[PDB]
Design a protein around this ligand. Structure first.
Ligand SMILES: O[C@@H]1[C@@H](O)[C@H](O[C@@H]2CO[C@@H](O)[C@H](O)[C@H]2O)OC[C@H]1O
Ligand SMILES: O[C@@H]1[C@@H](O)[C@H](O[C@@H]2CO[C@@H](O)[C@H](O)[C@H]2O)OC[C@H]1O
Ligand SMILES: [Mg+2]
Ligand SMILES: [Mg+2]
Lengths: 730, 733
């Protein structure tokens, strides 16, 4: 209420011009040249900045505020998605850690680095559920599961915002993209989203609510339609749900041009009408298109909006700044006047230890025939493929202020790990794509892919010569990071054809073949699963990726990563996800079942899958009783043993099924997990606790209750290989 | 009504056992052996039969009724989807005619032939909208468009049912599959359907309502969940919507095992609870699983259902029989006991002229380089491909009582056309698939695909020898009919790999290459569009298919067919459909940037759009003109264009009218079909086409499901496909 008092006294002093100026969020560029923008800040016409990311540049902008009548400070934002300068694995790789503390650490270090550069806010976490592998932005989320993504949503917010949003090493989380953005039809970015309310409430909305309940300060509004209404114009979504039902008290931010794009969506015929729809829906802050500054005065004078629409939006911007500590000290993240200057990109400001330890936890072992991995540091290892020496790709998409030249390649990680104990032989083998039109797409803004001027044939002949001179081949293959970014949707989920030709040529040498995969989405890997001797999924593993990958390949780290998104056998099976409905004719096999005829059915690799260099055993599942009273707790116990020869971690997963309900419920739903590190011969009793809240679902009328009757409890080391027992809720 | 008096006096006579017996719909099979079924009919324990399809067999079952206490007659049903004995093209090929009179004729002939064999009812039309090419049952529908499918839904019902459902040449339409069955997730048959209510009401439900409004006697309930609730247990769908809102007064029928499958869906833990959910939801008649007969008495005695649940279901069955004329004469479709026996499959009982004329109208010319088609009846023509001599495939899936040995193959149609004037050389070239697992699937239950035992290589060498000895190659390729049927969902939309290898080898001969495509779904044809010299889409063209295809190839018929479903460039683009939303960042010719709604690794848009199809002549359209720039509510607007045949051959095309509502309370489609005209023109002929548009054309369901037309701009597009249009605008006041 100090905050409410402070904001009400400030707003009672402000003109409408000053209130509207708070709603303007801009980036320096063609549309807002630096000197003109500086003059607007001085006039009180700017509320905040994004994409200005160094302390002297931010401090210069904050200095301009002292010229405005009320000297209301700016906040500065950036897309710190999975690292600021030190780049962690992409979020899909962090999720595969199954370890909230690992994910927390990446977020904390991101906030530490971003706040050290003067940033107040990140447009993160991204908590959109993804069941469609074709979407470019699957790399930005935590996979297909509502429970896990909801958990990590809360973890990311708490880790960014810390104990106090006014702390100089805290940043505000702007959770995105509200809402349902990863359900785009056809996996085409920005495309139509259409879904029932029970699916929306049960599966898609809970991660956004988890962020709000963790106290997220901001929400970034999505670019897509929800059931015909763009999120930027959706009063039900942004007012009724987010504010009135969920109690969100923070700031809504539009995406770039989102208010103007209501004209392309066909909700508005002109910019004046687009502005009215966005502010009355509940969008507080207008990114870059400047429609609010242009049209809000005219709309109010015409009685087309209410003073309360402006007041709500302005209070939310001021409340964000208040919580960030900026009214107490606008320079709290910008140090002192005549602090000595520093190199923003100095090696001494990176966190390589943390990036290497985090990156180890996300690597997923998918195949390991006859214990080929871990490798011994000996002999001659051929390192082949267009991603082996790529610094640009290892840091991934949404690499923020990450510097490619600071990153450790797979080749360099292997060189560092073996030193003089083994000989590495390098050949590029193929370009990332053989299709010049795809290479031109990827290099269209910036040179992001090195195109070897040699023929495909010459590169292959060199790679075969290299393979013949080696004891075994480490093929580093998959996507370049520009294939799994905003607007980069794919119609094919395989490794690119140029690289598959290389893999088929390398297989024909008879040399043991280890695949190191880099990719930002599930890939179709049927040929690789049949033909490679071992397969390690490394996503894009970040600044220290090459070192983390070498640590796993040589057995310094026993792989512990597990998939959080199902890998389809082909793009033609989309969508595939573990928490699907049974249907009336489930596939076991019979012709008259829910299936395809022209390919094997089910995912190639299921949700929760990942191998180890050791063996684990689970004892029989035991429940604390066969009947559960309302308000009572059920315990599900299992003993995990390391029955192999190497220390390692696995993830014990708990799944629930509600086999008779008022709605058809999923064949199983994740409801808990434990990541457990065990030395050989160690045993751990795992105790899962379940209550009524774990058993609730949204019915056809969106009643959120648990119905009496049977529940099935499954425990295992993936979604496919479980044991189950039942109990009855009374 | 005297009908409601008649039905109430009969129900006042009936025990609950008699009422519940009316709800039982069964087929002869392992689960219902013939003699046990006969004994059940005599006991009053059977309401209707399906899959008994000859006059003597139907007459024998109707004869059993005379032994029951009340002698209530059976009705007999079958899946007469696109023909009974004379098989027309599959429905997706009939829709490509764009001609309600052509579609009416196929349905009229179907009903004539089915009723002549004693059948009272067809489980048809199938009116499920299909936007996902992977689904096996796309072959059974009319494509992706709500307006077109809705129009043809009503045409099919009226054509089956005629002036009087008691007429001996009428059958009852059981419209299917209610509802949303073609929206299955992943295009996997029987899979989850999840969609918003505005999409449901605007795009998916209207064809079922068109069938109800045309007076369809029955509705067949679908197998899928709708937003979590199986259709068979969905009281909102079958009672609130179908009965209370739409006023449907007819019979609801479950699908095979659908009541029992509520256990697998996880709505019921046992058969007793599944039975309760189905009858209370509004399912009147139980197909095959016999749960109603087993459980309704126990449910009623326990107060778990109401007498009114049984009474509703029984009244609906009796009302169907009344309308069919079966209480007036149970033998009205079965002639007289004295009639001489006849051959059910006699040539004189077929309608080959109608099948040949209908089949010609559905063929779509997709490519014709440098006027290769039409062919001259001369020289040496190689006829190559696993579908060239296939009688089983030409009649399609859901071929009812069609006899493959009566069908005309593409090879036979070409032989019939050229007689002695040209030499045909045949080679199979490849099997339908090179994947043994796919062959195993296609020959499971019934052996439907002939496997040439030779290597792929030997078959190719034989086809290359044949091609080298000819002036040109007619390659007859695509899917077998078992690839586009119930449960046959595909993950690849290309021609099968064994056949694409054949086409690549044939291309390399340098011989002109004509592709004749058979298929039950849109195919991915990027290589074919680049490399074939001509491509003719023939779907599965039916009993006279091979003759209709020869008529088009030799120029006796100028191809007039147009696509009613978008052809994707690849399965990785699914779904692709013409009436999509713009998004905030459209990719189109006018919006070509990186940061648009697109894929980066393939050309964008469909390979062939909705409404696409070529001709052996050229057409021109005059400028579009509207009767005014402002439309008052209550008034109608006219949109006029002149069509000319500016080429050298007589032919038809389809003039298509689309609407856009560019500013609305909901994001509306970039265009929506709102009228069309198929026009046959001699060379140099012109026709003024007048489209009428009213407020009814402009309405949509908003977020609150209000059915509104909002004042403001509408754009009217006219053209010969959905990609090649021009527009004019008006303002609704
Ligand atoms: O937070 C992120 C936004 O910064 C991002 O905005 C994009 C920036 O580049 C522009 O050219 C694009 O047009 C624009 O959408 O969108 C994604 C969001 O996560
Ligand atoms: O009208 C058609 C039904 O008769 C058809 O029923 C099928 C009969 O064969 C069984 O093996 C199938 O399991 C069953 O669904 O289904 C589709 C409907 O259109
Ligand atoms: Mg239950
Ligand atoms: Mg409008």
């Amino acid at each position: 209420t100090d905050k409410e008092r402070f904001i009400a006294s400030l707003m009672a002093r402000m003109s409408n011009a000053e209130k509207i100026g708070q709603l303007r969020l801009v980036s320096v560029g063609a549309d807002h040249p630096k000197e003109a923008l500086m003059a607007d800040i001085r006039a009180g016409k700017v509320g905040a900045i994004f994409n200005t990311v160094t302390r002297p540049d931010i401090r210069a902008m904050q200095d301009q505020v002292r010229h405005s009548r009320l000297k209301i400070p700016l906040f500065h934002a950036y897309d710190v998605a999975h690292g600021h300068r030190t780049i962690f694995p992409i979020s899909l790789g962090l999720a595969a850690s199954w370890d909230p503390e690992v994910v927390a650490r990446s977020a904390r270090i991101s906030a530490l680095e971003a706040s050290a550069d003067g940033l107040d806010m990140s447009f993160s976490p991204m908590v959109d559920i993804t069941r469609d592998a074709r979407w470019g932005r699957v790399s930005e989320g935590f996979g297909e599961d509502t429970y896990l993504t909801s958990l990590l949503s809360g973890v990311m917010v708490r880790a960014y915002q810390g104990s106090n949003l006014a702390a100089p090493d805290s940043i505000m989380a702007a959770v995105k993209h509200f809402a349902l953005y990863g359900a785009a039809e056809g996996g085409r970015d920005y495309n139509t989203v259409d879904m029932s309310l029970p699916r929306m409430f049960q599966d898609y909305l809970p991660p956004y609510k988890a962020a709000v309940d963790a106290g997220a300060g901001a929400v970034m509004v999505s670019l897509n339609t929800i059931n015909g209404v763009p999120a930027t114009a959706n009063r039900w979504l942004l007012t009724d749900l987010l504010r009135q039902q969920w109690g969100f008290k923070g700031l809504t931010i539009s995406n770039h041009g989102a208010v103007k794009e209501l004209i392309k969506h066909g909700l508005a015929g002109n910019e004046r009408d687009a502005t009215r729809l966005a502010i009355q829906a509940g969008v507080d802050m207008n990114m870059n298109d400047d429609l609010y500054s242009t049209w809000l005065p005219k709309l109010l004078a015409a009685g087309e909006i209410d003073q309360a629409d402006i007041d709500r939006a302005c209070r939310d911007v001021l409340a964000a700044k208040y919580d960030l500590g900026l009214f107490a000290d606008p320079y709290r993240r910008l140090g002192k006047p005549d602090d000595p200057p520093f190199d923003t990109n100095a090696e001494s400001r990176l966190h390589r230890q943390a990036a290497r330890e985090v990156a180890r936890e996300g690597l997923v072992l998918l195949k390991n025939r006859d214990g080929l991995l871990p490798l011994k540091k000996q002999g001659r290892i051929a390192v082949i493929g267009p991603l082996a020496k790529s610094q640009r790709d290892v840091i991934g998409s949404w690499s923020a202020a990450g510097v490619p030249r600071q990153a450790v390649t797979v080749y360099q990680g292997l060189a560092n790990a073996v030193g003089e104990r083994a000989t590495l032989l390098y050949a590029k083998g193929a370009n990332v794509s053989g299709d010049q039109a795809i290479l031109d797409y990827l290099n269209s803004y910036n040179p992001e892919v090195e195109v070897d001027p040699r023929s495909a044939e010459a590169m292959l002949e060199e790679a075969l010569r290299t393979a013949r001179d080696a004891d075994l081949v480490v093929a580093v293959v998959g996507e370049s990071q520009g294939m799994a970014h905003e607007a980069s949707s794919r119609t094919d989920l395989r490794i690119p054809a140029s690289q598959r030709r290389l893999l088929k040529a390398l297989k024909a040498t008879g040399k043991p073949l280890v695949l190191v995969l880099m990719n930002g989405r599930p890939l179709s890997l049927g040929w690789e699963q049949e033909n490679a001797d071992a397969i390690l999924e490394t996503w894009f593993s970040g600044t220290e990726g090459g070192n983390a990958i070498a640590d796993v390949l040589f057995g310094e780290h026993n792989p512990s990563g597990k998939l959080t998104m199902s890998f389809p056998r082909s793009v033609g099976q989309v969508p595939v996800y573990y928490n699907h409905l049974n249907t009336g004719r489930p596939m076991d096999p019979g012709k008259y079942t829910s299936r395809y005829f022209d390919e094997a059915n089910g995912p190639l690799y299921p949700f929760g899958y990942g191998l180890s260099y050791t063996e684990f055993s689970l004892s029989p599942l035991r429940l604390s009783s066969e009947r559960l009273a309302r308000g009572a707790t059920l315990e599900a116990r299992v003993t995990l043993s390391n029955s192999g020869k190497r220390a390692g971690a696995t993830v014990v997963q708990l799944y629930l099924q509600d086999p008779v309900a008022s709605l058809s419920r999923p064949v199983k739903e994740l409801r808990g997990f434990r990541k457990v590190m065990l030395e050989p011969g160690e045993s751990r009793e795992i105790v899962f606790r379940l209550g009524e809240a774990d058993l609730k679902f949204y019915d056809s009328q969106l009643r959120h209750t648990a119905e009496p009757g049977e529940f099935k409890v499954f425990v295992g080391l993936d979604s496919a290989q479980t044991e189950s027992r039942s109990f009855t809720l009374l």
